[PDB]
Design a protein around this ligand. Structure first.
Ligand SMILES: [Zn+2]
Length: 286
């Protein structure tokens, strides 16, 4: 039962059923498993101009790049926001996971910033977007702690850009200091704008953790890579260490070495995330 000859799906369905609570951490692998990829034809088709100019390898590298000027920044980012936030369709793995989680006491933390939880109909009170969202903007000088949005301006930038530049008059500026807006994103050097809504999410996530310091708590980590381990992977390892009755189950095909203090509490499930979540749902619902 509560331990880390069954298939991966069978094992995962058994653990979720037996769990007292789930703390679910979701990264980029879950969206890639549903087809929302950041390398290969999806990127090449969407950004052939930028790829030819800069030799970008992938769409995540491109989204972090320090572009030539704000006209170029917004030409790239407007198209990036439409692809990954305004028009990205619902993912089946998100729907399948939701059907499982709605039977459980759970909370989600994600380093993703796409629309996936919203088009799949998740309750925003149960999700912490710790790395912001592509649909939001912040002052580029971080001059005050408020986020903004304007999807109509995004569509105008897509329609009116030419030659990798938005017209200068379309660039949006902060009302407080007149610096250009930028996408709400976290930088190592500058941090992120963290407004009232961000803190309300963080408080809900911290309250759920405080209620589940004991018991059969399943720390379920889905598609979380190496990029920013301080937000999900490392804190999950620490929570599992601190609660000897917790379990760490990671859906991943890279075999990151688990800390000694959680070796007896850890399981790696390597099967393709979409197919694994689908198979687990079918077992779980009977
Ligand atoms: Zn400002």
């Amino acid at each position: 039962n509560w331990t880390t000859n069954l298939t991966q799906a069978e094992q995962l369905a058994q653990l979720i059923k037996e769990a007292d609570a789930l703390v679910v951490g979701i990264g980029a692998g879950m969206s890639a498993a549903d087809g929302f990829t950041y390398i290969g034809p999806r990127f090449e088709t969407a950004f052939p101009d930028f790829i030819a100019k800069y030799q970008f390898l992938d769409m995540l590298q491109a989204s972090l790049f320090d572009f030539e000027d704000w006209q170029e920044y917004w030409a790239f980012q407007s198209r990036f926001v439409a692809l990954n936030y305004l028009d990205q369709p619902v993912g089946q793995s998100y729907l399948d996971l939701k059907e499982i989680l709605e039977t459980k006491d759970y909370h989600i933390i994600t380093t993703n910033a796409d629309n996936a939880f919203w088009v799949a109909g998740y309750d925003p009170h149960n999700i912490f977007h710790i790395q912001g969202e592509y649909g939001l903007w912040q002052c580029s000088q971080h001059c005050h702690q408020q986020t903004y949005k304007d999807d109509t301006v995004i569509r105008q930038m897509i329609a009116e850009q030419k030659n990798m530049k938005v017209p200068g008059q379309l660039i949006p500026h902060c009302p407080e200091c007149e610096a250009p807006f930028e996408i709400n994103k976290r930088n190592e050097e500058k941090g992120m704008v963290e407004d009232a809504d961000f803190h309300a999410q963080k408080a809900r996530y911290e309250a759920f953790l405080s209620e589940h310091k004991e018991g059969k708590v399943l720390y379920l980590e889905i598609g979380v890579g190496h990029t920013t381990p301080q937000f999900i992977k490392h804190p999950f390892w620490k929570r599992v260490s601190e609660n000897p009755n917790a379990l760490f189950v990671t859906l991943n095909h890279k075999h990151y070495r688990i800390p000694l203090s959680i070796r007896r509490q850890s399981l790696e499930l390597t099967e393709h995330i979409a197919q694994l979540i689908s198979a687990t749902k079918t077992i779980y619902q009977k």
